């Protein structure tokens, strides 16, 4: 029944990611708990060069966004780890070891310059789905990279947007559309034509009206997802998408485009717009209720909850009215939790400052692993793809 997980972190010191095998209930703060059974770093490229995003695409092969301005399509390999002797003058179970190797890759892809009208990362790397990718910086671009038929990455566009990007959304409840949004650059909607040679803007969000002390509300959206479309009768001349998304200011606002452009509700999550980023859909039992881009599949804002971070070491539960549900790792998480991501409906991956990768039961809270990996985390994938040969 319970096989062990394999985790793949970003580890931003040294710019490498680590593999990570455990099962439930590992934690190496504490000696009489579960270890792991294996933990290894690959891929080391230095600080100047550290992951910014992952996707995995399958077992075989992964494709990874860096700092350095580079993306690397990686081929994945597996071989079971042998179990040796300690003392030297038997046959017992084995699991699965992976080794990464570079294929091919893609170069120059940001601009420090565009940003100087503070520095250049990704933050986006989606299938647009199937060998199609895109790639997203700060700097406005989004580049759509491909597999070609020799298996080799090649760069079929480069299209401008608006800089800075805080985000980039993919639209994908049912025509290639998105979101996107940043530091005082206001939540626009963009169709890419499917020869992804140019694209178009079709909506630009208002900012809300001014307060009490008639002063204007700052503007910083920092997340972004995708609800279904406004049920029954619609008007003509309107698009109709729904989408939430999380601020910089310690906003959640809430959009339909039938409504108008101006956000139906922008409630304060926190006291003095504590800042925020981040934004994972969950259902409280743990259901998955997302997309494969985590987009969530219904068509009200009544049933959604959502998981922010701030910026010193909490992880906060929020509905779709802004009343909070709780926290995740009180206890336990002392740094900023620079990467959360809702995994399978049910689990909470977790890592920032405090160079501890973690998982959380989302219906229980329970934290179910805890593997202490030496570096600051900017990102997890977890797999599930792991052998066990008996003898």
């Known amino acids: 029944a319970m096989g062990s997980m394999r985790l793949l972190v970003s580890c931003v010191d040294s710019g490498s990611i680590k593999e990570v095998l455990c099962n439930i209930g590992t934690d190496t703060s504490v ?12 891929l080391a490229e230095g600080l100047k ?25 990686v081929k994945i390999s597996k071989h079971l ?32 310059a565009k940003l100087e009208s503070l520095v250049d990362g990704f933050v986006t790397l989606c299938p647009i789905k199937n060998n199609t990718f895109v790639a997203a910086t700060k700097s406005g671009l ?33 025509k290639y559309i998105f979101a996107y949004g940043g530091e005082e650059n206001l939540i626009k909607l963009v169709e890419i034509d499917s020869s992804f040679q140019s694209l178009k803007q079709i909506w630009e969000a208002k900012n809300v009206k001014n307060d009490r002390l008639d002063m204007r509300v700052p503007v910083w959206p920092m997340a972004l997802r995708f609800l279904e479309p406004s049920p029954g009768k619609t008007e003509k001349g309107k698009l109709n998408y729904q989408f939430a998304a999380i601020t910089r200011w310690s906003h959640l606002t809430k959009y ?6 101006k956000p139906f509700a922008q409630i304060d999550l926190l006291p003095n717009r504590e800042p925020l980023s981040q934004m994972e859909v969950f259902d409280a ?66 890592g920032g400052l405090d160079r501890y990768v973690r998982i959380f039961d989302i219906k229980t809270n329970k934290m179910l692993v ?17 052998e066990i040969e008996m003898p």
């Open 142 to 174: 989004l580049h759509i990279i491909k597999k070609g038929e020799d298996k080799k990455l090649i760069k079929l566009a480069s299209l401008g947007l608006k800089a800075p990007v805080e985000f980039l959304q993919l639209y994908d409840l049912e």
């Open 31 to 42: 000696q009489s708990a579960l270890q792991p059974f294996h933990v290894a770093p690959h």
């Open 256 to 261: 339909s485009t039938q409504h108008g452009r």
């Open 49 to 73: 060069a550290y992951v910014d995003r992952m996707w995995v695409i399958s077992e075989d092969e992964a494709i990874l966004a860096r700092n350095s301005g580079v993306v690397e399509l």
């Open 81 to 112: 780890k042998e179990n040796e002797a300690l003392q030297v003058d038997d046959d017992l179970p084995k699991f699965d070891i992976s080794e990464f190797e570079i294929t091919s890759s893609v170069s120059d892809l940001f601009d420090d």
């Open 370 to 386: 805890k593997v202490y990996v030496g570096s600051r985390i900017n990102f997890i994938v977890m797999l599930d793809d792991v």
């Open 285 to 350: 039992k743990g259901e998955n209720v997302v997309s494969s881009l985590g987009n969530f599949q219904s068509e009200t804002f009544n049933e959604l909850n959502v998981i922010t971070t701030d910026y010193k070491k909490n992880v906060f539960k929020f509905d779709g009215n802004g009343r909070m549900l709780g926290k995740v790792g009180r206890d336990d998480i002392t740094g900023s939790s620079t990467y959360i991501h809702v995994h399978d409906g049910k689990y909470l991956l977790q």
